[PDB]
Ligand binder design. Structure first.
Ligand code: HEM
Ligand code: PK9
Length: 460
């Protein structure tokens, strides 16, 4: 096999089994595998997903080279991951020049400029979220964050991308909202993906049969919805769809299905991500009352008598930013960053052969006792103006880095912050019947709690 590769390069790592590579070692999940390999093998190690070699790197200089310096030349693409269909055109899945084009075509849709006019729309569902909370606060019902935050994230997506304005929490049976509750992110350690990892030679077989990891039911509904959405009815708005089709006017030439694929990927991208992070944040706040109180104190100072948050007031809130950042340190939901090596290359004193997947293990790096004092504790002061400088931007990578980092980063931060401001203005959050303390991470392929976070909401 290719199983002698790392032994031949003098690169250490877990010894692999025939066919399986090292995938049995994922029985405790990616992040714990990554943590242990790091503690056992040091700064660089290798393992095999089936026959695919994967080189883990932890040196910031080396991480910078891969993510920033040699992105266009060598490390342009992610690992191809399964039968994908037309979604091959989605920006996050596209490769080389097709990616570079789509990235350029879609960049203007993520400038601070037009993010600001997205704010009132998002904001509108800040208030929606509140009443839904108030209804469950007044009746002292312990609250499923994942649900209420899930619905909020949906609402913000529907409206910001297509103009569909639905309180999804109380409209769960609406054609749009229902399996546009969707695309949930892929458990790459579930049996289907474990199998394609061992038999990647079966992927073209699935492709030919038009089998797709993206449910074609959901994909159908949307492609048509978008289509319909282009009568064109306008025959203003400031959503993603129109920011996307108004770019089809005036290199370039964004196809109309390609466009659909991006619409799909933006949901898949920002639905479960936003709501998962928002839940992890509320969990930390409830289990750290002083931090929650400080945050509410900051919010009431910037926005007196419960003032409506604005673009500029959001950015003004420093403790908020620290609380969001520190939650992302503990729970970097992407878990690893990856690029495929396109050419034989020697970087920072190490030769890396063509075809290796270079992997940066963000979860393991975010909790490395070398860059982080008492790494398991939730300590927002890590990110204060004072201590912020001692943080390496290639150790701390919740949104990746370089030309291929999270394109939706500014929007996600703004989104979450708006929601957290509006929520914290009206409620205090407290541990409860359920509350798994400490929180227990799932052993699956997703960075999420084992049991869903539930908390009491009390009206201020
Ligand atoms: C808390 C929320 C989010 C987190 C933590 C997050 C994190 C990440 C990370 C770590 C990457 C990989 C970057 C890399 O490989 O260097 C990524 C990629 C990406 N994200 Fe996000 N993301 C979030 C929300 C969103 C949202 C709201 C959108 C879109 C509206 C989005 C769209 C994308 C896209 C399109 C990519 C692939 C970019 C490319 O390949 O060109 N993400 N994200
Ligand atoms: C998942 C797609 C859309 C392919 O984007 C990425 O490659 N991002 C990181 C993949 C890690 C999978 C686990 C995961 O939870 N995804 C995080 C995510 C998803 C979409 C956008 N932003 C962040």
């Amino acid at each position: 096999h290719s199983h002698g590769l790392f032994k031949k390069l003098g690169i250490p790592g877990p010894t692999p089994l025939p066919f399986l590579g090292n995938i049995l070692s994922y029985h405790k999940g990616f992040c714990m595998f990554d943590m242990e390999c790091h503690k056992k093998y040091g700064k660089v190690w290798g393992f095999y997903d089936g026959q695919q070699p994967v080189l883990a790197i932890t040196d910031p200089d080396m991480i910078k080279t891969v993510l920033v310096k040699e992105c266009y030349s060598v490390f342009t693409n992610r690992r191809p991951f399964g039968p994908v269909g037309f979604m091959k055109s989605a920006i996050s899945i596209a490769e080389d020049e097709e990616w570079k084009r789509l990235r350029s075509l879609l960049s203007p849709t993520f400038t601070s400029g037009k993010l600001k006019e997205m704010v009132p729309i998002i904001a509108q569902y800040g208030d929606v979220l509140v009443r839904n909370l108030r209804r469950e606060a007044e009746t002292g019902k312990p609250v499923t964050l994942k649900d209420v935050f899930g619905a909020y994230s949906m609402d913000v997506i529907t409206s910001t991308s297509f103009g569909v304005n639905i309180d999804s929490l109380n409209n769960p049976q609406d054609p749009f909202v229902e399996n546009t509750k969707k695309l949930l992110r892929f458990d790459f350690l579930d049996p289907f993906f474990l199998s394609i990892t061992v038999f990647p030679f079966l992927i073209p077989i699935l492709e030919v049969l038009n089998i797709c990891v993206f449910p074609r039911e959901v994909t159908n509904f949307l492609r048509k919805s978008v289509k319909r959405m282009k009568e064109s009815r306008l025959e203003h708005r400031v959503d993603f769809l129109q920011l996307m089709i108004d770019s089809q006017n005036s290199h370039k030439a964004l196809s109309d299905l390609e466009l659909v694929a991006q619409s799909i990927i933006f949901i898949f991208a920002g639905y479960e991500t936003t709501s998962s992070v928002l839940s992890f944040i509320m969990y930390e706040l409830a289990t750290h009352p002083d931090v929650q109180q400080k945050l509410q104190e900051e919010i009431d100072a910037v926005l007196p008598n419960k003032a409506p948050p604005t673009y500029d007031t959001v950015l003004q809130m420093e403790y908020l930013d620290m609380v969001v950042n520190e939650t992302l340190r503990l729970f970097p939901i992407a878990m690893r960053l990856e690029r495929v090596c396109k050419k034989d290359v020697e970087i920072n004193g190490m030769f890396i052969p063509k075809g290796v997947v270079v992997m940066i293990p963000s979860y393991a790096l975010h909790r490395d006792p070398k860059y982080w004092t008492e790494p398991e504790k939730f300590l927002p002061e890590r990110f204060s103006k004072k201590n912020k400088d001692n943080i390496d931007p290639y150790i701390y990578t919740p949104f990746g880095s370089g030309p291929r980092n999270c394109i939706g980063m500014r929007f996600a931060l703004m989104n979450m912050k708006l929601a957290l401001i509006r929520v914290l203005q009206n409620f205090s959050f407290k541990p409860c019947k359920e509350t798994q303390i400490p929180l227990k991470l799932s052993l699956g392929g997703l960075l999420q709690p084992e049991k869903p976070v539930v908390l009491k909401v009390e009206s201020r």
